[PDB]
Each structure stands twice: as C-alpha cells, then as structure tokens.
Amino acid sequence: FGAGPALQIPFPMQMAYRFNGIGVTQNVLYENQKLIANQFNSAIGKIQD
Amino acid sequence: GKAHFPREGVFVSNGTHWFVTQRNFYEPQIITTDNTFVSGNCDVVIGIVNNTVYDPLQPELDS
Amino acid sequence: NNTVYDPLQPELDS
Numbered sequence: 001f002g003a004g005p006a007l008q009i010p011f012p013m014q015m016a017y018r019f020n021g022i023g024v025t026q027n028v029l030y031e032n033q034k035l036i037a038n039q040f041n042s043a044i045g046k047i048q049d
Numbered sequence: 050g051k052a053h054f055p056r057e058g059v060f061v062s063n064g065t066h067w068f069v070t071q072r073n074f075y076e077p078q079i080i081t082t083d084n085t086f087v088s089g090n091c092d093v094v095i096g097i098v099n100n101t102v103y104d105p106l107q108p109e110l111d112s
Numbered sequence: 113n114n115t116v117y118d119p120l121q122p123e124l125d126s
C-alpha cells in the first residue's frame with residue numbers, strides 16, 4: 001500500500017509472502033494456518049497484559 | 050488431490066481460467082508442473098481450488 | 113541466433 005497505488009491482497013497471502021521472505025516455503029503457513037493465527041492472538045493478548 | 054503451490058507468484062484467475070503470475074506485474078503463465086511445487090494435499094489447504102496442472106512431458110513421451 | 117539444448121530429447125530416443 002505504501003509503494004504507490006494500494007493493492008488488495010487476502011490477508012493469509014500477505015502472510016505467505018512474509019514467510020517466504022524469511023526463508024520458509026509457502027506451504028508452512030497453510031499447514032499451520034490455525035496454529036499461527038492462534039499463537040499470534042495469544043502474543044497480542046500477552047502484550048496488553 | 051495433491052496440493053500445488055506457485056514456486057513464485059500467485060495463482061490467479063479470470064471468469065474461466067487460472068494462470069500463475071509474478072506479483073508485481075500481470076503476465077499470466079500456464080500453470081504447469083514446472084511452475085508449481087507440491088506439498089501436502091487438498092484436505093489441508095484452506096481455499097484450495099480444483100484445476101489441472103499441465104505436464105509438458107506427457108506429449109513428448111507420446112510423440 | 114544460437115542453440116538451446118533440451119536434455120529430454122536423447123532420453124526419449126535412448
């Protein structure tokens with residue numbers, strides 16, 4: 001969105017990109033999609049606490 | 050039944066056909082076995098769709 | 113103008 005015009009991307013695909021960007025194949029995210037979302041949610045709650 | 054993922058780019062489509070293309074520029078390719086990788090299956094990936102992945106070897110074996 | 117080699121050809125013939 002900050003590169004010029006903004007381009008819509010389904011959120012899980014934005015994550016697939018971000019994961020690929022750190023060396024892990026874009027299959028990890030789907031195998032663990034619920035795990036990843038749950039860990040994320042937990043971490044945010046921990047910050048607020 | 051196996052799950053094919055882009056090696057790079059995104060799987061996208063118009064009203065009738067799926068193509069794979071680089072994220073920053075629309076240049077649709079035929080989705081083939083040389084464009085995808087396989088990992089896991091259709092029982093796991095959420096949002097996976099039904100299509101045919103083309104194998105360039107088949108006609109060479111027959112020709 | 114030059115050529116590009118395709119490794120499959122001799123495999124189909126062998």
Ligand SMILES: *[C@@H]1O[C@H](CO)[C@@H](O[C@@H]2O[C@H](CO)[C@@H](O)[C@H](O)[C@H]2NC(C)=O)[C@H](O)[C@H]1NC(C)=O
Nearest residue numbers: 031032033034035036037038039040041042043
């Ligand atoms: C990777 O680590 C995570 C986090 O410890 C594992 O997920 C947990 O698994 C236990 C059961 O052993 C569940 O009770 C927890 O609720 C799970 N956590 C979440 C956020 O879902 C995960 O199973 C491990 N995966 C592998 C392949 O080892």
Ligand SMILES: *[C@@H]1O[C@H](CO)[C@@H](O[C@@H]2O[C@H](CO)[C@@H](O)[C@H](O)[C@H]2NC(C)=O)[C@H](O)[C@H]1NC(C)=O
Nearest residue numbers: 061062063064065066067068077078079080103
């Ligand atoms: C989606 O894109 C494809 C690719 O250009 C269009 O299908 C082509 O249509 C021409 C003209 O009839 C044929 O000669 C090609 O063989 C077709 N390509 C393929 C892969 O079948 C298709 O019409 C487009 N669909 C929509 C809804 O716009």
Ligand SMILES: *[C@@H]1O[C@H](CO)[C@@H](O)[C@H](O)[C@H]1NC(C)=O
Nearest residue numbers: 010011012094095096097098
């Ligand atoms: C996309 O959203 C619609 C509407 O909520 C839902 O029915 C569909 O299952 C969702 N698909 C995926 C892959 O999340």
Ligand SMILES: *[C@@H]1O[C@H](CO)[C@@H](O)[C@H](O)[C@H]1NC(C)=O
Nearest residue numbers: 050091092096097098099100
């Ligand atoms: C593909 O079609 C089969 C039936 O031949 C069906 O059982 C399966 O769920 C479909 N898969 C997807 C991703 O639509």
